[PDB]
Amino acid sequence: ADELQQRAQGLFKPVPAKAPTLKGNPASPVKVELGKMLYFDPRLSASHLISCNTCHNVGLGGGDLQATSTGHGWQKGPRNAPTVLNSVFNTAQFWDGRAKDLAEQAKGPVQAPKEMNNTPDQVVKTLNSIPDYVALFKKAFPGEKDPVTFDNMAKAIEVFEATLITPDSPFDQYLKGKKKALDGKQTAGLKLFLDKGCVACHGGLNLGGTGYFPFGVVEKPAGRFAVTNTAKDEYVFRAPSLRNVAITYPYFHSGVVWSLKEAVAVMGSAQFGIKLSDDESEAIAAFLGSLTGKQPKVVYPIMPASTDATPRPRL
């Protein structure tokens, strides 16, 4: 019946109306602003061409519209740039890896050598080179004889991301009150997302983002990609958060599947013992579309100028 609503209210949870407090990283006005500038400063990279936003494009659903990201040197990477919208709520920091490696973790500072091509110390050199950024670190991180450190730099970055959230997606307004926030097809898709076992791995605050599982997608030797079992190789893949999934194509860790309907079709896997008909993998995908919230209103930061003591671009 409409038991479905009350049901969903217990498995899922809307995105809070406001950025969550980070532990040991008190968000404040300057801190967010400094983090903002930082997220959008290509000088955090060696070339001075790549920022975070180059690959986690707030204007484009948070990702990079690439199958796999291409960083320094025009090098094509091994992985999809996952969104940065709502990342604040995931605990599973990687796509994939050995189970014995992933096992423990977390939670560390953002590190992007390879993609940005900068050692942490070079990053700290650059920051220290620009006066305005120092005055800014002192304001954001007050008690320190030295605030200009890769940890505080990360804290500030991450406090900005805390605000990159997406409240009131139609589905969130359905979990709140409005039952006709979802439409027929979408509401049909909600039920199938549940009664086919999808919420097992894609559940909670972020519809995923929280756990590792020994299943991944590959090329079939002989519809064209399929979920494989990596239990034997002691490997695991993250079950990504499905929030805003409509706007972050292409899909999976390798970005091999561009169509959202088609990606449902792969996920309705024999390995999890789920069978989907096209109408169900249609309908579900519909509901997936209901998970697109209100995109970030961001004023492009006015970043400060390099001084004679700033390292030159190493392309």
From 3, 33, 104, 115, active-site residue:
115
Active site residue 161: no
Q: How far is the CB of 260 from its own copies (least distance, A)?
A: 10
Q: How far is the CB of 206 from its own copies (least distance, A)?
A: 20
The residue from 249, 269, 272, 311 that contacts its own copies (CB under 8 A) is 249
Residue 23, classified by CB atoms within 10 Å of its CB into exposed (0-12), middle (13-18) or buried (19+), is exposed
Beta carbons of 238 and 217 less than 8 angstroms apart: no
Residues 6+ apart with CB under 8 A from 133: 34, 37, 127, 148, 304
Q: How far is the CB of 272 from Ca ion (least distance, A)?
A: 20
The residue from 8, 58, 136, 157 that contacts ligand HEM (CB under 6 A) is 157
For 34, phi and psi rounded to 5 degrees? -65, -45
Report d(CA 17, CA 28) in Å as an integer: 17
Q: How far is the CB of 64 from Ca ion (least distance, A)?
A: 9
Report d(CA 304, CA 202) in Å as an integer: 41
Taking alpha carbons only, the member of 245, 179, 236, 180 closest to residue 206 is 245
Report d(CA 35, CA 166) in Å as an integer: 19
* Residue number closest to Ca ion, CB atom: 248
Residue 267, annotated as binding a ligand: yes
Which of Ca ion, its own copies, ligand HEM, none lies near 94, with the C-beta cut-off 5 to 8 A by kind? ligand HEM
- Name residue 314's amino acid: R
Residues 6+ apart with CB under 8 A from 308: none
Do strands 212-213 and 215-219 pair parallel, antiparallel, or not at all (unpaired)? unpaired
SS3 237: strand
Find the part of the chain contacting its own copies (CB under 8 A) among 14-22, 90-98, 102-110, 245-253: 245-253
Residue 308 lies near its own copies (rule: CB under 8 A): yes
The residue from 51, 80, 90, 173 that contacts Ca ion (CB under 5 A) is 80
Find the part of the chain contacting its own copies (CB under 8 A) among 62-70, 90-98, 103-111, 211-219: 62-70
Binding-site residues, in ranges, read 52, 55-56, 72, 74, 80, 90, 95, 198, 201-202, 217, 248, 250, 252-253, 267, 272
Chain contacts with its own copies (rule: CB under 8 A): 37, 40-43, 47-49, 54, 57-61, 64-67, 70, 73-74, 76, 246-247, 249, 258-259, 295-303, 305-306, 308, 312-313, 315
Binding-site residues for heme c, in ranges, read 52, 55-56, 72, 198, 201-202, 267
The catalytic residues are 115
